[PDB]
Design a protein around this ligand. Structure first.
Ligand SMILES: Nc1ncnc2c1ncn2[C@@H]1O[C@H](CSCC[C@H](N)C(=O)O)[C@@H](O)[C@H]1O
Ligand SMILES: Nc1ncnc2c1ncn2[C@@H]1O[C@H](CSCC[C@H](N)C(=O)O)[C@@H](O)[C@H]1O
Lengths: 219, 219
């Protein structure tokens, strides 16, 4: 049920709002802060993979790729990127953005797909800022499936805390009549049960954006 | 450092690299390097062409060699000022430009150490030059080039990459290349310190040629 709700959102009001944030057009201070925060997360992950030295020719799965904010710079650096997203609107935008940026050079292959139904095998599987849309119990099933696609590495980002959303939930009960945080201990446990140990980690914190980043490597 | 590099490109380096950057017959290694370098040049020309404002664009080509980049930029209408520390390279660039461009739009070539260049340009470009200098001096060079760029600084460099790692490992297995690789994190930091952020990037990878390309724009 959650999948349909998230999908419909990113195919409608969510598409327009987030394509503007992930884009380069004029935005208000709230959206700008979130753009900056998200850009930091993307940049951090690209930096990790570039630093390793083996990114050119590296098989990468970008699960829940959105408008290709991560797919595109990875491809620019020589990666072989397979991007997928549950939202056809997001996928279409990613394809158009990649064609505008990369023309006919090294570029991702994009596909509309629920990550839970994703197949194939990759050196590195990446899932950024997607898990926030699902409760912990559903996140475990998602992480476990992604881990099954990862020959060596799984990178995830999640919010340990969602202030604004938490505030909204608590305020909601105060009148007649969402987002999900994940505990790092819970995420690390799920990764461990799938045979992964934690390598590098990172953290992005701005005014309205908070993302914990974990690099997990197969033992 | 620069004296060694200048003397090389005024003697044996001139003879060898003029041939590589030319169209004549070469060995399999130099051929691969020719192809890789051509891809780098083509990618940069493609970037500037894509912007749609190349005609009349004031461009500095620092370390221009035989004008492999300067000439096609001038062909597309750019106002190109090319310079190189080697007068032999400059002389060859001028001869090549006169041969193919006649009296039409063409670069102005000058013999000069890029660290001593003056003027102000919309876009400053330095391709495949930083490989001849250690990170310390490379940093000083980047800072100087940035001071000449009103808007944009484009750099290419050999990064830490697996292809080059393999070659160095094999080399260490026998008793016994003056080519400096640079970490992308170091380059990005230097550019950031000079008030520049990264826009487009690219990566040329052949058998023996590896060139990371960064487009940096003034914030
Ligand atoms: N079950 C699922 N399978 C694949 N993608 C999903 C998904 N649930 C949500 N998504 C997608 O996850 C995206 C979150 S926005 C994050 C986009 C991208 N990872 C980035 O960081 O730039 C949305 O585009 C949404 O459509
Ligand atoms: N300090 C310096 N200032 C200006 N040019 C330099 C320099 N040190 C080396 N060079 C020049 O940098 C060139 C590197 S070969 C690269 C040439 C050109 N950028 C191209 O990609 O086609 C050589 O011609 C060499 O003479």
């Amino acid at each position: 049920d959650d999948k349909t709700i998230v999908r419909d959102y990113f195919n409608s009001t969510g598409f327009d709002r987030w394509r503007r944030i992930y884009g380069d057009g004029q935005v208000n201070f709230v959206q700008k802060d979130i753009r900056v925060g998200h850009q930091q997360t993307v940049d951090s992950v690209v930096a990790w993979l570039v630093a390793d030295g083996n990114l050119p020719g590296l098989l990468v799965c970008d699960a829940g790729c959105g408008v290709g904010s991560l797919s595109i710079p990875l491809a620019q650096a020589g990666a072989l990127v397979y991007g997928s997203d549950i939202s056809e609107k997001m996928v279409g935008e990613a394809q158009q953005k990649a064609q505008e940026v990369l023309a006919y050079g090294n570029q991702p292959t994009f596909m509309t797909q629920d990550l839970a139904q994703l197949g194939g095998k990759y050196d590195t599987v990446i899932c950024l800022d997607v898990l926030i849309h699902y409760p912990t119990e559903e996140a475990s099933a998602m992480i476990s499936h992604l881990a099954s696609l990862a020959d060596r590495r799984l990178i995830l980002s999640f919010a340990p805390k969602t202030l604004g959303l938490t505030v909204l939930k608590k305020i909601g009960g105060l009148f007649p009549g969402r987002a999900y945080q994940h505990k790092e201990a819970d995420i690390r446990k799920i990764l461990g049960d799938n045979g992964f140990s934690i390598a590098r980690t990172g953290m992005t914190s701005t005014r309205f954006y908070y993302s914990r980043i974990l690099e997990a490597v197969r033992s």
